[PDB]
Design an enzyme around this catalytic site. Structure first.
Site, PDB file in Angstrom:
ATOM      1  N   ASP A   1       0.800  -1.223   0.000  1.00 10.85           N
ATOM      2  CA  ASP A   1       0.000   0.000   0.000  1.00 10.85           C
ATOM      3  C   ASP A   1       0.833   1.274   0.000  1.00 10.85           C
ATOM      4  O   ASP A   1       0.260   2.371  -0.082  1.00 10.85           O
ATOM      5  CB  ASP A   1      -0.959   0.019   1.191  1.00 10.85           C
ATOM      6  CG  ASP A   1      -2.225  -0.757   0.920  1.00 10.85           C
ATOM      7  OD1 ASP A   1      -2.676  -0.767  -0.250  1.00 10.85           O
ATOM      8  OD2 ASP A   1      -2.768  -1.356   1.874  1.00 10.85           O
TER       9      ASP A   1
ATOM     10  N   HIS B   1       0.420   8.111   9.482  1.00 14.35           N
ATOM     11  CA  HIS B   1       0.840   6.727   9.702  1.00 14.35           C
ATOM     12  C   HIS B   1       2.334   6.489   9.536  1.00 14.35           C
ATOM     13  O   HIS B   1       2.818   5.429   9.951  1.00 14.35           O
ATOM     14  CB  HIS B   1       0.123   5.766   8.742  1.00 14.35           C
ATOM     15  CG  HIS B   1      -1.358   5.726   8.921  1.00 14.35           C
ATOM     16  ND1 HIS B   1      -1.951   5.470  10.142  1.00 14.35           N
ATOM     17  CD2 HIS B   1      -2.368   5.901   8.034  1.00 14.35           C
ATOM     18  CE1 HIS B   1      -3.267   5.488   9.994  1.00 14.35           C
ATOM     19  NE2 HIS B   1      -3.545   5.744   8.725  1.00 14.35           N
TER      20      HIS B   1
ATOM     21  N   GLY C   1       0.237   2.879   5.232  1.00 12.65           N
ATOM     22  CA  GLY C   1      -1.026   3.481   4.816  1.00 12.65           C
ATOM     23  C   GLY C   1      -0.911   4.673   3.876  1.00 12.65           C
ATOM     24  O   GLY C   1      -1.555   5.701   4.089  1.00 12.65           O
TER      25      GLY C   1
ATOM     26  N   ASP D   1      -9.184  11.780  11.679  1.00 19.05           N
ATOM     27  CA  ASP D   1      -9.225  10.807  10.599  1.00 19.05           C
ATOM     28  C   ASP D   1      -9.987   9.552  11.021  1.00 19.05           C
ATOM     29  O   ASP D   1     -10.032   9.198  12.200  1.00 19.05           O
ATOM     30  CB  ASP D   1      -7.781  10.441  10.224  1.00 19.05           C
ATOM     31  CG  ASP D   1      -7.660   9.753   8.892  1.00 19.05           C
ATOM     32  OD1 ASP D   1      -7.921   8.537   8.815  1.00 19.05           O
ATOM     33  OD2 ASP D   1      -7.228  10.410   7.929  1.00 19.05           O
TER      34      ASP D   1
ATOM     35  N   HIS E   1      -8.983   6.690  10.619  1.00 17.03           N
ATOM     36  CA  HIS E   1      -7.975   5.742  11.086  1.00 17.03           C
ATOM     37  C   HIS E   1      -7.215   6.284  12.289  1.00 17.03           C
ATOM     38  O   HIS E   1      -6.995   7.493  12.423  1.00 17.03           O
ATOM     39  CB  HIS E   1      -6.994   5.398   9.958  1.00 17.03           C
ATOM     40  CG  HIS E   1      -7.662   4.776   8.772  1.00 17.03           C
ATOM     41  ND1 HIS E   1      -8.203   5.525   7.752  1.00 17.03           N
ATOM     42  CD2 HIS E   1      -7.950   3.483   8.485  1.00 17.03           C
ATOM     43  CE1 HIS E   1      -8.771   4.720   6.868  1.00 17.03           C
ATOM     44  NE2 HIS E   1      -8.622   3.474   7.286  1.00 17.03           N
TER      45      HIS E   1
ATOM     46  N   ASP F   1     -12.211  10.836   5.758  1.00 15.37           N
ATOM     47  CA  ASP F   1     -12.746   9.512   5.475  1.00 15.37           C
ATOM     48  C   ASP F   1     -13.798   9.053   6.480  1.00 15.37           C
ATOM     49  O   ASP F   1     -14.303   7.932   6.349  1.00 15.37           O
ATOM     50  CB  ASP F   1     -11.621   8.463   5.337  1.00 15.37           C
ATOM     51  CG  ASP F   1     -10.452   8.665   6.292  1.00 15.37           C
ATOM     52  OD1 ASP F   1     -10.475   9.534   7.185  1.00 15.37           O
ATOM     53  OD2 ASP F   1      -9.472   7.911   6.118  1.00 15.37           O
TER      54      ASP F   1
ATOM     55  N   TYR G   1     -11.221   9.646   0.449  1.00 15.90           N
ATOM     56  CA  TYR G   1     -11.086   8.923  -0.806  1.00 15.90           C
ATOM     57  C   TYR G   1     -12.235   9.180  -1.763  1.00 15.90           C
ATOM     58  O   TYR G   1     -12.229   8.655  -2.877  1.00 15.90           O
ATOM     59  CB  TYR G   1     -10.904   7.433  -0.495  1.00 15.90           C
ATOM     60  CG  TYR G   1      -9.723   7.334   0.423  1.00 15.90           C
ATOM     61  CD1 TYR G   1      -8.436   7.388  -0.089  1.00 15.90           C
ATOM     62  CD2 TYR G   1      -9.889   7.312   1.806  1.00 15.90           C
ATOM     63  CE1 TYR G   1      -7.337   7.366   0.740  1.00 15.90           C
ATOM     64  CE2 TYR G   1      -8.783   7.287   2.652  1.00 15.90           C
ATOM     65  CZ  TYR G   1      -7.519   7.311   2.100  1.00 15.90           C
ATOM     66  OH  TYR G   1      -6.415   7.286   2.917  1.00 15.90           O
TER      67      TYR G   1
HETATM   68  C1  LIG Z   1      -4.740   0.101   4.346  1.00 17.03           C
HETATM   69  O1  LIG Z   1      -5.671   1.020   3.781  1.00 17.03           O
HETATM   70  C2  LIG Z   1      -5.647   2.305   4.243  1.00 17.03           C
HETATM   71  C3  LIG Z   1      -4.790   2.765   5.229  1.00 17.03           C
HETATM   72  C4  LIG Z   1      -4.863   4.084   5.641  1.00 17.03           C
HETATM   73  C5  LIG Z   1      -5.793   4.955   5.084  1.00 17.03           C
HETATM   74  C6  LIG Z   1      -5.940   6.327   5.666  1.00 17.03           C
HETATM   75  O2  LIG Z   1      -6.752   7.140   5.227  1.00 17.03           O
HETATM   76  N1  LIG Z   1      -5.174   6.580   6.714  1.00 17.03           N
HETATM   77  O3  LIG Z   1      -5.435   7.706   7.485  1.00 17.03           O
HETATM   78  C7  LIG Z   1      -6.632   4.498   4.069  1.00 17.03           C
HETATM   79  C8  LIG Z   1      -6.570   3.173   3.636  1.00 17.03           C
HETATM   80  N2  LIG Z   1      -7.266   2.690   2.493  1.00 17.03           N
HETATM   81  C9  LIG Z   1      -7.867   3.471   1.561  1.00 17.03           C
HETATM   82  O4  LIG Z   1      -7.569   4.644   1.398  1.00 17.03           O
HETATM   83  C10 LIG Z   1      -8.910   2.851   0.684  1.00 17.03           C
HETATM   84  C11 LIG Z   1      -9.957   2.143   1.276  1.00 17.03           C
HETATM   85  C12 LIG Z   1     -11.054   1.746   0.528  1.00 17.03           C
HETATM   86  C13 LIG Z   1     -11.127   2.029  -0.825  1.00 17.03           C
HETATM   87  C14 LIG Z   1     -10.079   2.704  -1.447  1.00 17.03           C
HETATM   88  C15 LIG Z   1      -8.979   3.099  -0.687  1.00 17.03           C
HETATM   89  O5  LIG Z   1      -8.019   3.718  -1.472  1.00 17.03           O
HETATM   90  C16 LIG Z   1      -8.528   3.702  -2.762  1.00 17.03           C
HETATM   91  C17 LIG Z   1      -7.860   4.154  -3.879  1.00 17.03           C
HETATM   92  C18 LIG Z   1      -8.478   3.984  -5.109  1.00 17.03           C
HETATM   93  C19 LIG Z   1      -9.731   3.381  -5.194  1.00 17.03           C
HETATM   94  C20 LIG Z   1     -10.388   2.943  -4.052  1.00 17.03           C
HETATM   95  C21 LIG Z   1      -9.781   3.105  -2.809  1.00 17.03           C
HETATM   96  K   LIG Z   2      -8.161   9.523  13.972  1.00 16.89           K
HETATM   97 ZN   LIG Z   3      -7.867   7.459   7.163  1.00 16.25          ZN
END
Ligand SMILES: COc1ccc(C(=O)NO)cc1NC(=O)c1cccc2c1oc1ccccc12
Ligand SMILES: [K+]
Ligand SMILES: [Zn+2]
Ligand SMILES: [K+]
Length: 399
Positions: free
Chosen positions: A99, A141, A149, A176, A178, A269, A313
């Site tokens: 990621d 993160h 992340g 956030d 997360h 988010d 997102y």
């Molecule tokens: C490990 O994942 C994260 C870890 C940390 C964070 C965060 O915001 N931290 O504060 C977010 C995610 N996952 C996603 O962003 C994600 C979640 C769902 C759908 C999508 C997502 O990305 C996309 C990009 C393109 C298309 C669809 C998506």
């Molecule tokens: K938070």
């Molecule tokens: Zn987040």
């Protein structure tokens, strides 16, 4: 004044990543379309006198070998050849994979957020601005030697380090979806930076921390014991319940800590329309957006404040929220009414806001008391350990 970080190359770099695409452009262009830019002080991103000075700034938190690896990853992705097996192993050792992949601008992209948030901290320190906004930052993160992340460099930790090193205490508030694990970890042993994250937590949900760990709730260590606060929330929470959940905590932290600075991560988010589809917050400004409730409360303290972005997102809806946060900040700091049309104004990205082109997002809207008791006791424990003076019953009555 209220400052905001932008610039031509800054915009280009902030729009250069695969995950976040042109989100920053949508955000800033919606703010511009609503005629807010003349109300804001442009804060230019920090630039350095030499590679050595840049490394000195970034390695105030990150390890040299991690920064070296992040720069090499960029260089390797600007060539056509695949990575060698040894270079794949090197990147894996820093979690520069999965990621947090490489791309041709990964170092310049991640460094840009640091440049913006460091400049924002400096503008607060010298009192040029009472509040500064950086919608290109908030990457909570990233760890000393690990990407996490889609956060490669922790601009928040570096900005906070600049603030404390300017007794100075910083309150960090992470809105956030997360858990703000990287910032929490960076200051785990420091009582001068109190961190508070509200977030979703549940089994298998990223990053896994910020909740019960029989399980215990860890909250800092050494002289930083009791200095890391967390409020994990179950899925589905709406504006009102999230606001009532965090409101007394925020007010209590401000009363006890009396921070010199507040740093707020405002990842979008939690919106009901985020593809995570976990919380049900809005950007409504009459139900009142939990985000706007929290920012308004924080700004009522009249403490110099850094406001950062983060997750989010659904790019148009993140722009919808952060435009409303930006207008609110102007109103609360300057006392100047910011009237914002419910209809999206015409501008280059207007088509991204269909089909209805309105500013409101398109959404029809016990456990917490236990957490409140736990957090109030932790705050009492923090104040006792740090010999802080405060009325326990005025704080207790907030809840
Ligand atoms: C490990 O994942 C994260 C870890 C940390 C964070 C965060 O915001 N931290 O504060 C977010 C995610 N996952 C996603 O962003 C994600 C979640 C769902 C759908 C999508 C997502 O990305 C996309 C990009 C393109 C298309 C669809 C998506
Ligand atoms: K938070
Ligand atoms: Zn987040
Ligand atoms: K801490």
């Amino acid at each position: 004044s209220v400052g905001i970080v932008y610039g031509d190359q800054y915009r280009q770099l902030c729009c250069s990543s695969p995950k976040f695409g042109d989100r920053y452009a949508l955000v800033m262009d919606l703010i511009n379309a609503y005629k807010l830019i003349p109300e804001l002080s442009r804060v230019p991103p920090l630039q350095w006198d030499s590679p050595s000075r840049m490394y000195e700034a970034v390695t105030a938190f990150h390890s040299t070998e991690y920064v070296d690896a992040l720069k090499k990853l960029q260089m390797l992705h600007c060539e056509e050849k695949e990575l060698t097996a040894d270079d794949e192993l090197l990147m894996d050792s820093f979690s520069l994979n999965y990621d947090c992949p490489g791309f041709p601008s990964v170092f310049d992209y991640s460094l840009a957020a640091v440049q913006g948030s460091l400049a924002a901290a400096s503008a607060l320190i010298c009192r040029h601005c009472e509040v500064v906004i950086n919608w290109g930052g908030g990457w909570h993160h990233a760890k000393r030697s690990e990407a996490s992340g889609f956060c490669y460099l922790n601009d928040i930790v570096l900005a906070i380090h600049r603030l404390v090193s300017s007794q100075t205490r910083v309150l960090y508030v992470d809105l956030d979806l997360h858990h703000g694990d990287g910032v929490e970890e960076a200051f785990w042993y420091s009582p001068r930076v109190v961190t508070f994250s509200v977030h979703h937590a549940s089994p298998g949900f990223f990053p896994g921390t910020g909740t019960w760990n029989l399980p215990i709730f860890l909250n800092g260590a050494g002289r930083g014991r009791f200095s890391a606060f967390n409020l994990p929330l179950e899925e589905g929470i709406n504006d009102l319940d999230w606001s009532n959940a965090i409101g007394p905590i925020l007010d209590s932290l401000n009363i006890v800590i009396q921070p010199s600075y507040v740093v707020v991560q405002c990842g979008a988010d939690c919106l009901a329309t985020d593809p995570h589809r976990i919380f049900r917050l809005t950007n409504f400004y009459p139900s009142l957006s939990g985000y706007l409730y929290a920012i308004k409360k924080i700004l009522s303290w009249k403490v110099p404040t850094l406001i950062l972005g983060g997750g989010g997102y659904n790019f148009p809806d993140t722009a919808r929220l952060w435009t409303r946060v930006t207008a609110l900040t102007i109103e609360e700091v300057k006392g100047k009414k910011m009237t914002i049309s419910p209809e999206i104004p015409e501008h280059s990205y207007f088509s991204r806001y269909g089909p209805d082109f309105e500013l409101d997002i398109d959404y029809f809207p016990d456990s917490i008391q236990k957490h409140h008791r736990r957090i109030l006791e932790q705050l009492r424990n923090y104040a006792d350990l740090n010999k802080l003076i405060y009325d326990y019953d005025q704080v207790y009555q907030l809840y």
